[model samples]
Target chain A: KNPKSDKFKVKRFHHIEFWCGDATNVARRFSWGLGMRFSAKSDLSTGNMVHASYLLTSGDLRFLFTAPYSPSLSAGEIKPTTTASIPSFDHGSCRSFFSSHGLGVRAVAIEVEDAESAFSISVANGAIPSSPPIVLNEAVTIAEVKLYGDVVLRYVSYKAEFLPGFERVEDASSFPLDYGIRRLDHAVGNVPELGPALTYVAGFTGFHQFAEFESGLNSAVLASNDEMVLLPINEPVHGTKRKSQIQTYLEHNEGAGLQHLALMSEDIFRTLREMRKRSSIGGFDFMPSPPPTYYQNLKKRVGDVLSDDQIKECEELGILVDRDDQGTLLQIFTKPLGDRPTIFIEIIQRVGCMMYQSGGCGGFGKGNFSELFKSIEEYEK
Target chain B: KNPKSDKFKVKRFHHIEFWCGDATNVARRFSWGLGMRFSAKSDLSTGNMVHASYLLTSGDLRFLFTAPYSPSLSAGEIKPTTTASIPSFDHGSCRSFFSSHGLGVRAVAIEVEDAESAFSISVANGAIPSSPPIVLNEAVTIAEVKLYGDVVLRYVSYKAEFLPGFERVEDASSFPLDYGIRRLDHAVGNVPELGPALTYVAGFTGFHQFAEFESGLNSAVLASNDEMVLLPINEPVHGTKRKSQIQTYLEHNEGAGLQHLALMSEDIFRTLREMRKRSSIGGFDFMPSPPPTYYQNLKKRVGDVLSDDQIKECEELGILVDRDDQGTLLQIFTKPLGDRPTIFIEIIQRVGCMMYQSGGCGGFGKGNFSELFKSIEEYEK
Candidate 1:
């Protein structure tokens, strides 16, 4: 029996929130490492006595980092004078999750039509409500539900001003810059078992199975109705000759949680060039390239979807290319963000895929997984 | 009455170790943000099944970062296969301290004549021994004693290849660079009160009171025999009108702990220029400048010590200058390192102080205190 919810619908991602030990330094890292610009902040200066948060943005992507302040307030220095309402949920779990996963995503907020309906409907349909809907302003409302592990799914009906307490941070010298990144394409999660978890997820949100991997692949993708939000979920497949990558992530992350977010780029070549130039200093570290043979055969498989210079640049930059019936895709994954091999990021660009077809993802790089997996395997050696 | 110990003697600082959540990334931050180079590492690859560590160095300075791994071992993925002895002390407190202070100093190691003698003498003289002496190799012996709060005073006898288990990281493309920093001039600690903390610190080591700040200032400095290691300790003083800088640090830090490390440089002009160029991007952020009056009166205060162009550059770079009977000191401080205003860094250069006189620190910036305090006070407003 197929179950579908009619009470609420998700439009797209509003933002992704990370709970870390130090929001200021981490946000600065993002600013220098990637091309993210400081957009807003909520701190003691902003009368936020409980936590320090910084909102960073690039293109349509919003990355919010929140760090809870220790309760040991200095004798008479700072006092809670916000007079505003309390935060949406208890931040106790925020500290606990950080201890468990160092620096990691605590929530992936979904843009919704009505946050109150999203909260009520999801709670009634077995989703654990973390916070009731709260109106931040006339045009903004937000709520939360426990998704898996310590990660939450936030429902935010929002606008230009990022939430209520945050002060907009645009200044004459804020150093707003770009490296061609456009948006977050998809967020991947690693679960112990795909079927039961997928069943549990589809029951409340009515997100449908968009694709499934055979040995072909060992993953499944779920998409919203308008194809605005895609979540690709994975589990360690049994009877494999080698250890599963998904299993290791689940192990290191402590449980099921958001694994990687694919950052969509309009031009992969320049984005990668800029990222590589900064990588040795303040930027992301990409995995080593697949064997030379793989790059040599790129044109044979994708059939000139890219020019000779593009393919040459792809080989030089260690980018992977794959094609499906809809179109061609190019991608690269960064090394893990922290000590453990838990969370990472992906830079991806699409070519030839119409919006009416596959939401412009081109392809999920299914054809590139083997070479990428083997490359990772070799990297471990 | 003066109390002193003659059992062991300290020659210089060995290194400082930091306990953090993600040693890998934190070490990377040090590399890019300060021009330190990756030196050595110990991790799963190095058979350190319980934690990962990375050592970075610039000039004569060593900064070691260690992070504990979750006890949850991925099934059959990794095993503790090292035949070496365990660490000097139980690393359980390592994890606890990281949670309490985010990324912070756990221990300050001193290069002593004999590690075993240092431990035994300190223990017999009222210092709480955290670990007995452990000889890592034929050349090196190390021990630890409880300092204050969560910080420990580690004593090590010798070096060359950092420690026993770390593999030196030297590759063709490792990007070893320097920013003109010479060595660690001093490490400062903040405590609740000056008298009791200073008394406790003096009882275990033969360290003597080198200087006592008059209103003048409100701090104390302790030094070893050859003046190789200098420690400046600060405690908040009660006043009629303002909050104490030391008190806020003690509170946010949870207790008495390391406040900052002063990095000495030879050429202030070029170092400040390079650091300023990198400041807004991946480098340090300095506090706001002192009032214009402070700069306009620079020549009146430290006459003919610095050129007019030098003073102009100093004002542009927000550098502070102060002079004593012996020499002049140039210094700049970075904003707090983390979310909490617990710990920070100071870059300093000394002029005119001879090796035979004061161990090259020139002046401890005593003359610049009032201006700096007022500058910080106005910053709060």
Candidate 2:
């Protein structure tokens, strides 16, 4: 738990900054929903600021979103809420509540020696510098890193770089989240005391544990390194606290950041059927439906561990099931992507699983907080 | 410019509170892009604070997006940039960078009685001192107003009831973003503005200029409005400010709030071809193309007025043209759904247009910002 204090020198992850009231529609929906590309764009308009950066694969995972200026000194009149009655509390209601919870930059995780030196040490660590390496002629090499703040890094080069059918995307079974990034899994993070921040992030990112669990009531860890990524990390064990949902995600994710992000798939039934057909062709929504008595008590407590025809085909595809000790793990969760439930996206699979709570692979929320608060109070009344 | 002395006897409009890092993904993408729904939801560990509210017809407009269960001890983690070594930014990247930069809650425009009695006075100012009207069974009559600080205010009732495909939305072609919503149509807010305090939010939110601008020598205010809403608040107007986009969206958007939203649609080409075919089947990336010499210099300088197939059908559909000695308004500016551009979304149309910047739209942005600043100074060489 002390490694990082050698005057902390980690520096490689680069990029995960969001402020965005609207940095050009969050850089054009993050370069078309993660196909990352924009390269560069800046408009400080006399320092009023409006920037842009996008790249994928180059280095050090990146995703920056910024938006500044206009706090009005004499420019007035932008009253859509019309000076919100002034009952008291305000900051334009926290910039119109993070500009209507659009959920920007969920997670960025980066570090490299591979994956193209983590996309060029995430654009020379400090990323956010843009437009310099543009060889769209073809096949890899597109750098754009200049960071000081507003976190942005996109340095693609999985091979064949300027997107045009994305260099047959590593033999396409799927490869279009804007042209590269397909691995860099694990990133949960709630932290209040998952054993002193998982022994201080496994003594400064050397990451280890790989997996662990305990449950007279609670305790977890997943940790990892050798660049496989993983991180999990939780809190509340036995001391029995309340408001749990990992203490409402460490009280609305302000401290340790990055709350949800699993994404790994050799084929979780073909990546949840192509991410539910690209979220129903992007009409999006669907991430609620959970209980069918949790897949009929998970096929009578893992009878044949998976088959009852894959737990009746993951409860007719609402999908979610878990188990541990070293097996069972198929999951589903994606409802919080801003407005503070704290970033989300989990799509796991492990037919000989390692486990990471899908309600702890169906032991049914162990501490049995009154059966998980009467099953979310009878599924939200 | 002197009209106040404390006179808001609650005359008009009221309702717009947004915090939402994720109210179930803004109630599933505003019910598939502003169809608006979600009677309510918030348990927050037996509710001390957490919210959700949305409405469109049944009550003359209500929109809320909140989050508070200790949102990092009530909105902290502020670092958008200033290098504290990063990590102090999260609220779903300031709510998807104000919903991709149209800026958040650009409008809420409420005051009913005729707007359906201000939707039963916001459901009797959000009943529940004792309780009796959370009503959602259908004959309309829904109510919610919660506002001690954070915010909430849905109070609907179109004719009084009908959830079966709820209706009520009207259109004068969205009367310039629902009149007095002036331009940033709906609205919301909470807190999170950092550094030089958005220039003290123009001395505490009153906002007013409707139009005036200049790029190079930076003469600004291309639009401002407290008549209801029209904010261009953003800082760094120039000097290439890049402490990470608009000074990091006025430092974590805790200041000025409610950034973007300008929805009106009365068939601005069938609501922009059904919201650009649902952003090209949900790939939604800031759609804007621009080029063809911005419609060949707006048909050789407004060919004395209009026509030329309406400026080559708004430069073959990348729209953005503003004229003002009384007419000419087809605009388009989006790209900031997160990462801090400060929320976004704008789709306007006005054939007779009217004046807001005229003089051939400021000489076509001074000949397209001198070829976009000489191709951004040859891509910064």
Candidate 3:
């Protein structure tokens, strides 16, 4: 049966909270490099004396980056106990995670109709309860469940402006190049065993596996019932001498964490062009250039769909093109977000598709996977 | 005897090495906020697999930000030990320091003619040796000594380009606004007992107190023999109920640390105007505006030295003006660089000075101390 017909529904992807060693600088990078604006802040000035968090947003994409003032407290220490009825999370876990893995995604929050129901259903379905459903002032109610490694999955419903205890940041500056990244298309998590993680998400959150890839690297794409949130869970295949990208992530991060985030863009050509312009000038670095053979193969595969000039432009910009039964997707990858080969970004544009339609090119660009791996291998060298 | 005639000479301020938990983002902030260019980098790709460093430079000022791959390795653990007689240092101390204090300046390197002699002399004068003088691939010789609160005083003599392991980061992007912050003027350190710190510098490095100020706060300015390096040391007066700025820094920083760095600007009006424009757009935040009475006092004190339009411009931009016996200096302070109230920046322009002359205005804007304390007190609130 289709999960969308169920009683409980996950409305959308609310926000992603990153536990960082220095949230202020990480927020600045997101603003300067990705064109996200500083939307809100919770810190000493805003009555958050334990740690500091910066809320950044671009279109529907929201990021909450947090770091503690001192390292003595672990991320688990700063967080409220699982039995606590109130909504109070400590930055101690953030410190502990950062100390082990460096910078990484800590929590992924999903917008749900009822926070209590979501927490109850997830725990009943074998998911570990990280925190009980608790009301945060009059603005929001939130609950948490354990995910891969130290990552937490949060269910939140808001009644007031944004999350509780966050003050709107006035006079926020805008970057010159907007980049036009509109929404979170999907987030990929790298775990040691994908079966349990996929089963946990599907059974607890009422998500269904929409697509599965059995290529050298294994991945299972799961989508929420409402078709709003997509998560592609990946695990390395056994006995790969060259090492899978997911394996690299696990080693560098020291545990399972967010591997990459694919951001949807209406005009990926312009977005990537702007990104490259910035990258050339030291703003940010994209993945290593794709092999020339990859572009040649792309032109041969989609020669009938795109014009010669368009193919040539894609080749020049290192944009990879791939096709499914119904449509085509233009995509590119950025270098790891930080120094480690842990987290990175993916920019994608689905062409010739109806708005919010699932039938057209629901899978990642499988044809480009080999080329992407080649570029990643070069980067690792 | 004046230290300017000493046998060992320090030419100028070399560079400041900041021990960060995440050097990548910190480098981005320095590049985007201060208009500094990413000049060099050393990471896994560059054969420095243990830690990563980004060397950013603006005019003659250089900042080397370093971060370890894991929390197990402290900032000091990566460096060479004191008796190694080789180029080695550990990051363990840095990690420990960061765990306690968060991101902070770990070392202030001084440009020296002979690093070996500098190390020998300092160690002979009761300074604890942190690292022995060692050659780096025939490019540079370096040594280190312990300073207040885990800070290191490095003596570096470079013959080749930048540092030995770092490769030049070509094609670095330039920001729109050219802040024109040229060189290091002075670096202030906040300590519990000012007398011993001052005596250590004066005795070991042959620096002399050139200027002393005693209002509510206490400060002593020490200058290198050639007057190329200046350090303004500050300590909180005991038994102040409101708490001094130095006391706040000591407490938040968990002991002693580099409090601020004063960057010299050729044109204060243009610099302050550009800084304020960026501040208004949320690029950076400056200190709170001085009371209208402070401007009235400025006009009364040096009304003849500046035109009404100049005075008005300074007031509009929140620039502070102070005059010594020989010349006047225009200055402004930025809010704390990060979330902690430990370190910040000071922009200063000494007007009516001959190019590269030392006699113009050797002292910090003492007249602005009370006004600064008022602004800082407001920030503490």
Candidate 4:
């Protein structure tokens, strides 16, 4: 493959920042439900007076949750005349974003060898510049580009602590729940139009379409050259008799936004078992279980790959299975992470097949979409 | 006890409502971290289009987490010109309350035999009626009175479901966590002027100061005749050389508000042990540990009551021990539950002393106040 046609030079995701009303609770959810460790924080006590930010990590996955400090007061209380010391950028965007979308992703920062080069290329290739490249001290440089809806893609290069102004937060309060999630497998974005989003991703970041599928809506999965990051973009068709899930997302979310994120797990069986246990006792809601028809169809299609015992366990746990000629994949999705049915989570495990001489395909389970959609539809009803 | 002074005729706490920006994550945190079950919910899915509410319960303790839907939209999006179907009461109070105080308790609903009588008495006694008595579908009646800051005291009479519009939801998703937490022990409120707030509680609700203590700040613990609900009110003295913790709460919370909640735990040893295990890995933050000096002083004060092994265990777990003529109390405080240092949690276990001639005192541990204040002061630093 030619160098340009090869994987995009992007390294990996640095972190995804969610602008929320309460960062502490969101962080706690990730800690207790997903088993991410609270690593660091920036707050009034840590010199960040405008907003509080928390960092949670599990393996290579990092999430940054932020919340602004804008307290409403009674008449007799002393209110600040002006927040001069607080940066305007800190409060307005996040506060507005949270007001509109609640707890949703605001920035997806990707680690890169050269931040300036990445920003320059993306902007030159029609990406709207959200933020120009800025050097933060000698150790870090960053830039951002506007993405679908209110989301921004950040490119960062850092040698010092995680970010400037962040202090190490040692919370020896308890042990984090262990969910076995390793890293981000992919992130799906819901858009009003999928074609343009896919084109934008390909044009700006040199990612190429890996696979395309259509059920109730149109979806195209794209991947960088290295296949380190996979993005699936979905859009509702112009006029469908039944409202597409994408349309529901767009309406309920108020606009386009992140649909869901799939995290990789080595042993999806154990992951699903633990997840179900947590949900049953802990009150976390996983996606609805697949119907008997789904298992019947799965046995008919992939009986040779998955054993009867495996199928029984998957059926019991509501884990979905899909296969290509290359290999079989196991996956499960959680219910919407919040009230709005916009964002969710998926746990996936890919197994190599000995029957296939060629390598396993890395695309989403096309066979699983129909069942997944039905499950989601059942939830909405 | 005199009928007039009899626990103000309040049966027990019906529920406490928290007005928040995002109720989903807060509910999840309570469920996953504190072992509360997500028993019920009211949202768009349940025909509640204006706001989302989640009900979590552990034993008799019920917490209603509510957040209004106020979507900020772009100019081109089809914004609802008017929410005619949506109740004005849903969006106005909660939306404005969240804007001002972020996430804080709005109402402490007390179960009563007759809501009308409760409302009439309180109103006659100089309570500001926040909401007039309203009969809901002949099954429930509710009335509210303004309390300190923006919080309200709600009187409720119910003969049917949990509330008028709340549908019974059975989520067979998981088994509820069993943390041995039974019921609410007490709730503390912070105020700039304690005298007025205390007087308001007494004159309006017929509650009396059961216990009084002065350490860094003045505190008075009040209870109804039934003694089911206990409230501790704190105020900073004027012209104090150093700001009291109550003053810190007022400044940080931006007004008088709930300071902390004490949860009654039957087996605090196991509870603290499990809590420590969760914190070690789960990333939850408990209150700062008491200093060695605190333990040394504790040994000097109550060494006879607590064995060397018990003191060692308490020291290891950072659990505080308090003794009065009535009994000994084992307690520990969690760091602020959110970003603000205003609201936190307290886990407490009480044991009757064999030496006490009469029943044990039903009051907050005055002996623990100095050490608790020192722990909180260290957190501020």
* Best prediction by DockQ: 1
Winner on DockQ between 1 and 4 is 1
DockQ of 2: 0.11
lDDT for each residue of candidate 3 in A256-352, tens digit (9 for 90 to 100): 8888888888778877787776663235678766766666666667888788888888878888887776678888888888778889888888876
Reference-based TM-score of each model: 0.92, 0.29, 0.88, 0.85
Q: On lDDT, who's better, 2 or 3?
A: 3
Error of 3 at A78 (Å): 9.3
Candidate 4 lDDT, A1-381, residue by residue in tens:
213352225877778888788888877776667767777787877755567788887777888888877633222222233321212234667766877877788887888877888889888888889878766656787888887888888888765467766777664433454678777777788998887888887788887667432465788876666656677888887577676778878877888888888888867887777767666543357877877667766787779878989888888988888876567788888888877778888888877743522222434777787766665566555
Number of the candidate with higher lDDT, 2 or 4: 4
TM-score for candidate 2: 0.29
Candidate number with greatest TM-score: 1
Error of 4 at B230 (Å): 2.7
Query: In candidate 1, what are the lDDT values of residues A1-381, reduced to their tens digit?
Result: 113333477777778988876776677776677778888888777776667888888899899988767655423433233322236533457667876776788888889988888888888878888878877756688888877777888898865478877888748326666788878888888888888777767667877777432232267777777666887888887666767777778877888898899988878888888888777665677887776677667778775688878888998999999776667889998888777888999899877757443553565777677766665566556
Best-first order by DockQ? 1, 4, 3, 2
Show pairs that collide, candidate 1: B214-B217
Selected candidate, larger TM-score, 1 vs 2 = 1
DockQ values, each candidate: 0.46, 0.11, 0.37, 0.41
- Looking only at chain B, model 4 earns a TM-score of 0.85
Full ranking by lDDT: 1, 3, 4, 2
